[PDB]
Amino acid sequence: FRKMAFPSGKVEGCMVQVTCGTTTLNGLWLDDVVYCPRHVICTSEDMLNPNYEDLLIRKSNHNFLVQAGNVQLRVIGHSMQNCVLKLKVDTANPKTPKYKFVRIQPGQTFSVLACYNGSPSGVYQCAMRPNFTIKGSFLNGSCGSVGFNIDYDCVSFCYMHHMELPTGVHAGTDLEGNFYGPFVDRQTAQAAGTDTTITVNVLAWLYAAVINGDRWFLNRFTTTLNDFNLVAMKYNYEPLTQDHVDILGPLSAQTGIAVLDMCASLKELLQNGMNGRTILGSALLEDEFTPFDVVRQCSG
Amino acid sequence: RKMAFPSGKVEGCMVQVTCGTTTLNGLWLDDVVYCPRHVICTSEDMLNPNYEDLLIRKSNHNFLVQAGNVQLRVIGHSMQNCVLKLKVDTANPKTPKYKFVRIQPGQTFSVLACYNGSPSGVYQCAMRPNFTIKGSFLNGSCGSVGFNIDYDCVSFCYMHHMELPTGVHAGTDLEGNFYGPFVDRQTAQAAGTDTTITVNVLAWLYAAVINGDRWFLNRFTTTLNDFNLVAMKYNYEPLTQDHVDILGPLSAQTGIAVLDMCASLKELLQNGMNGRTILGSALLEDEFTPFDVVRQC
Numbered sequence A: 001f002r003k004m005a006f007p008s009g010k011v012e013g014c015m016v017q018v019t020c021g022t023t024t025l026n027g028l029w030l031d032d033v034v035y036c037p038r039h040v041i042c043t044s045e046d047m048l049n050p051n052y053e054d055l056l057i058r059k060s061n062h063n064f065l066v067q068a069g070n071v072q073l074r075v076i077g078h079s080m081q082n083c084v085l086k087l088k089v090d091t092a093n094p095k096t097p098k099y100k101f102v103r104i105q106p107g108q109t110f111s112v113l114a115c116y117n118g119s120p121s122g123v124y125q126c127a128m129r130p131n132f133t134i135k136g137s138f139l140n141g142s143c144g145s146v147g148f149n150i151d152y153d154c155v156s157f158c159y160m161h162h163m164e165l166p167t168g169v170h171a172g173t174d175l176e177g178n179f180y181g182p183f184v185d186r187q188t189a190q191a192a193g194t195d196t197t198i199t200v201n202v203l204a205w206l207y208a209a210v211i212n213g214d215r216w217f218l219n220r221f222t223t224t225l226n227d228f229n230l231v232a233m234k235y236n237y238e239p240l241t242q243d244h245v246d247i248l249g250p251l252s253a254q255t256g257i258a259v260l261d262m263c264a265s266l267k268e269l270l271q272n273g274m275n276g277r278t279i280l281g282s283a284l285l286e287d288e289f290t291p292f293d294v295v296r297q298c299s300g
Numbered sequence B: 001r002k003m004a005f006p007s008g009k010v011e012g013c014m015v016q017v018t019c020g021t022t023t024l025n026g027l028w029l030d031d032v033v034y035c036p037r038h039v040i041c042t043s044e045d046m047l048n049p050n051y052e053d054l055l056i057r058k059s060n061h062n063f064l065v066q067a068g069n070v071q072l073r074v075i076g077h078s079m080q081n082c083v084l085k086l087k088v089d090t091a092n093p094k095t096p097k098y099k100f101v102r103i104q105p106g107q108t109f110s111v112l113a114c115y116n117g118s119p120s121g122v123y124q125c126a127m128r129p130n131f132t133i134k135g136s137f138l139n140g141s142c143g144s145v146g147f148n149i150d151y152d153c154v155s156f157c158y159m160h161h162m163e164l165p166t167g168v169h170a171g172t173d174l175e176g177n178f179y180g181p182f183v184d185r186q187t188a189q190a191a192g193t194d195t196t197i198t199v200n201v202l203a204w205l206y207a208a209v210i211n212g213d214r215w216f217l218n219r220f221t222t223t224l225n226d227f228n229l230v231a232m233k234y235n236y237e238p239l240t241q242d243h244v245d246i247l248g249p250l251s252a253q254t255g256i257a258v259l260d261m262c263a264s265l266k267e268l269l270q271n272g273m274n275g276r277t278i279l280g281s282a283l284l285e286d287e288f289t290p291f292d293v294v295r296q297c
């Protein structure tokens, strides 16, 4: 199993650059709107303590330089929605895919198209941590890069990049400008909650092991969801939700192993350790493959 | 972070190729579609296919090429080693600037995994020293390609043909020559003993340091040859002076001499990681090149 990104072409066709003064970042061009982080309107000095409504009132359409490559897109309207700027432009993007804006939950994975100056540099798979950070690879100028999933014809945009934390992890918003987690777009020191292990994804990984014939850890017992959740928290594992139990349905059906039986197997691993054994060629439990990711790499 | 090149320029080239009941992917550049020649085989052909004999018995019309909902008419075909070249009456307007290259073991590339001419996923691979790749490929993935992008130019280096019993993968360059001692017949094939790409392990250790992780460093040093003696004992590839030179920028950036990092790696090889982890991994990672690390740091 490897981290596998979605093909990035449909998103590459939507990346532009947005500049205000000398501050440049990336934007997302869909139909006749460009979406980008609102801190593009900030001087480096104003990022320390920005008053965004005040900064925006002083801006006009003609203060925004939007470019696809080196080709300018004329801005004909502007508005702020939470922490994102929406710039109406006079050209509808002919490469606009079928798309939607979604807000993902911790544990869910998505592909990031890392961009600089509106130019895509690389694509990689990220997991949203339970503390609402991602372990990105982002350099200066990467803001406005987006995270996405692709289902059939439709690009689901879920993440737009805004900042790095002192610990090196990354934070950002959905495409409605609402931050994931307790973060704000100010150049102030901000700390994330202590992180935890994504239980639903560990379970997905155990199911993947079973599918591949690696099943020594299956035991004869079961548990209730509440008993499991209370034990899991003592090992810094996330509690399971009802939605987690449901998204494990397909893998449970594929293997014939009930979700709560797998929970009891995981509980034994937590309480007793691996005892020098491995699972899928590893003594570490992997928590950044979702149930869908497992099905992706096992089917096509 | 393992990072692939953006795949859009390659996505615009992927098509579906069918012959008989065999369907796989092709690469459509200008007015030519490239694909694995074993598309012309049947069940009974695959064991010992005489490809020149099988191919002469085919007509242009035995090949169905589909780009989305549009069929492309094949107006000519030829074989170059293990690749079939199908001439079509339409030029791909999405053809990028491109070249065909043969990569060296230890080099990395991105794979666009495709099924039925449709892109499914992208990931980074290394050409192993034993000329396999550790890919994620299923039935119908043949004809998927590997590539690197420099400026606006796509350098195609890999086309996918097979899986080995061990679960690793084998394929060709875009001239149709295999990497490694493999053959496009339906037989169980073993690879040579694999080794670890040492220059890449060192690059990744430097990446761990750049991201503030240094538990594995030490105050010892080593000569190049003494390091290589230990490396070979542990089935690591030897480190050349060009490798040392290639690592210079990472050495400068971090203030750690290449041979000092070799001494750290030696200590890791002889003692293991004693439970610790580097950049999240319980194992030494060898599929990041020095360039991969630099570009991202």
Ligand SMILES: *[C@H](O)[C@H](C[C@@H]1CCNC1=O)NC(=O)[C@H](CC(C)C)NC(=O)OC[C@@H]1C[C@H]1CCC
Residues within 6 Å of the ligand: B024, B038, B041, B046, B137, B138, B139, B140, B141, B142, B143, B161, B162, B163, B164, B165, B169, B183, B184, B185, B186, B187, B188, B189
């Ligand atoms: C082409 O799509 C397909 C891709 C492989 C299928 C499963 N995973 C793959 O990467 N290629 C093939 O099926 C090969 C065709 C021959 C003619 C080259 N064969 C193959 O990969 O077989 C796999 C198993 C180990 C070998 C045992 C043969 C008796």
